[PDB]
């Protein structure tokens, strides 16, 4: 009956199982993965928030996420990230 | 599509202007920074570093310009780019 | 009668004092403007620039370089030189984290 | 068999991300695509680091990733290293590296 | 209806409390803003503004000028330990640098 | 449609300038620098204040978050004065209802 | 004595400072470095602890948490992964 | 016999050893006592989560190791192999930690 503290750890596990099904992760390693997701969430959302504000928009859309991603990630990482983000939105809106 | 760089119109193609960052100008910059004596290797090295600096600020500035759907880079675009790169500038807006 | 001639360093020190008292941009404006336009062509064709955006850029470059030369001057002096060299600039940028 | 994440093809929680964007003081409103895209990117980066760190764990005959494997992954990748250039990974150490002037002759 | 007093005037301030409140609400900082917050923040911005203008004013006077320019602001800030720290990563257009020549570069003989 | 309005802190900057240096004025550019400065410290304070309230599971930015933000952002002597001036203003404001 | 018990700073031993320097690839060490490092470590902890404790007071707590430190490290441009970010 | 490594050789061995491992290098209790001392100047009768003291230790050690790398480069830049206080000073001035 303690706090109820959310984290990305179940999702980190799921991704780990996709990419390396027979490997596991220490709890400190999971903590660092958790730290990482929060850090990059914040960086991206913060830049997106700024992009919208600079442009007098009230809405953060996937286009603000994408520009935020181009500003924030290094070249190759950003091409792939953009590509995975797009693909996910395309796949999401077509689905239903 | 017909027309390539001249698809969008009227002659604005660029030179090799890095040499327009002259030795004397580089020496004035170094003077303001307190430097008394200068190796001959410094001038071409500074041009390199200047170029890298501008590539990075301009890339971000232009990203802000494309996001706003404009074709004109603004002082604010640059200001926002400079802030991002941890090089906050005062006197041009923001 | 020899012509007048300052010894090496004397005019350098004079120039240091001169430019440290002033604030005026030290790179010539037109060449810098072309340079900016040329670099931006790599990211997007047929861009216009507000004049103030170009001035912003020049203000930020010159301040960046004056700052780096300060650090570079310190790196030369740390190695008992008075002459700044590429390896000075390289050390300062490496310590700053600009470079690996 | 639908959940926002499944539609999008993702492991990361689109709904949670959506809620975090909305309550995070970023903007008045958040469009429906934003959390899909954002959760996609977070999963992509998470996958890269885990692919590499999983490899570093294998290379050292271990079945579990530990902070060192994460550090080895990140610091030997030129672009992950830049993205995380002002970040300290606890219990990660540093990369082996000794300046050549300090090595003895041949 | 009573005749209206600015929140600034009740606070004893030159800085716009009401504008600051508005900028806090519309800046995406929190869901709600307390009535004190913009009063406090407006005061702080006034204090810091006053402090820079005090010192730049002195720099202007020292230069035999009536008007503050960017250089006076730069001289003020950089010569002040505390402002220099606050604005340590900030570039002041047309400000220049502080006169500073490293001792080893001065010629043989001293001071 | 004259030419759409652009806010600035310059009337307030001028007012404070007259308190501090009655016979001193200020260039357009210097004014531009002061404007930049005010918006910069606004964002820094408001952002740290935003963070404080978020870490503590609060929806409201109060004078207390402004105060802690100021203590984190400003170096010693500036911070003491600022805390003093913001304490005076709130107190005054509150007593004048 | 008050050499360690109110300059606990001396508990940062010469051996420990060398180990740190070793992990940073340092081969040889001037004897004056151990005092210099102690000054530097203290300034660093002063700055970080000041901010953490400010987070602690604002939360009306008497116990400094890992999150206080993490937030403090982040303000100082010194982001830390693994302790609850 | 006099079997003896030359000056420098054990240093390099130590470098290779500490660069391979990730354990904290400052002893824990002395570090912890330092934290509590420094903290008292800001507020009395403060308590600490253990993970807080560990977070502080991790950050400090990471900081010092990274500062020793830059210091090493500064010594080498001056054609030495021996880090000196003026090397630390120069690293810190260029990093912008000190004026
Ligand atoms: Ca980029
Ligand atoms: Ca000599
Ligand atoms: Ca990669
Ligand atoms: Ca491999
Ligand atoms: Ca006041
Ligand atoms: Ca005053
Ligand atoms: Ca006065
Ligand atoms: Ca700001
Ligand atoms: Ca040990
Ligand atoms: Cl060289
Ligand atoms: Cl959207
Ligand atoms: Cl309030
Ligand atoms: Cl020394
Ligand atoms: K925000």
Author numbering:
A (entry chain R): 30 to 125
B (entry chain P): 9 to 102
C (entry chain O): 36 to 135
D (entry chain Q): 14 to 119
E (entry chain M): 11 to 121
F (entry chain N): 29 to 125
G (entry chain L): 18 to 102
H (entry chain K): 37 to 135
Manuscript excerpt for this entry:
In order to depart from the closed nature afforded by the 169a constructs and also reduce the interaction degrees of freedom available to mono-nucleosomes, we wanted to establish whether multi-nucleosome conformation is sufficiently robust/predictable to foster more elaborate engineering approaches. Therefore, we designed a first dinucleosome construct by fusing one of the paired termini in the 169a dimer structure, which yields a (2 × 169) 338 bp DNA. Reconstitution with this blunt-ended DNA fragment (338b) yields two nucleosomes that share a 24 bp linker DNA between them and each have a 12 bp linker DNA terminus. Crystallization yields exceptionally well-ordered crystals, allowing acquisition of a 2.5 Å resolution structure. The 338b lattice and dinucleosome structure are nearly identical to those of the 169a nucleosome pair, with the 338b DNA blunt ends even stacking against one another.
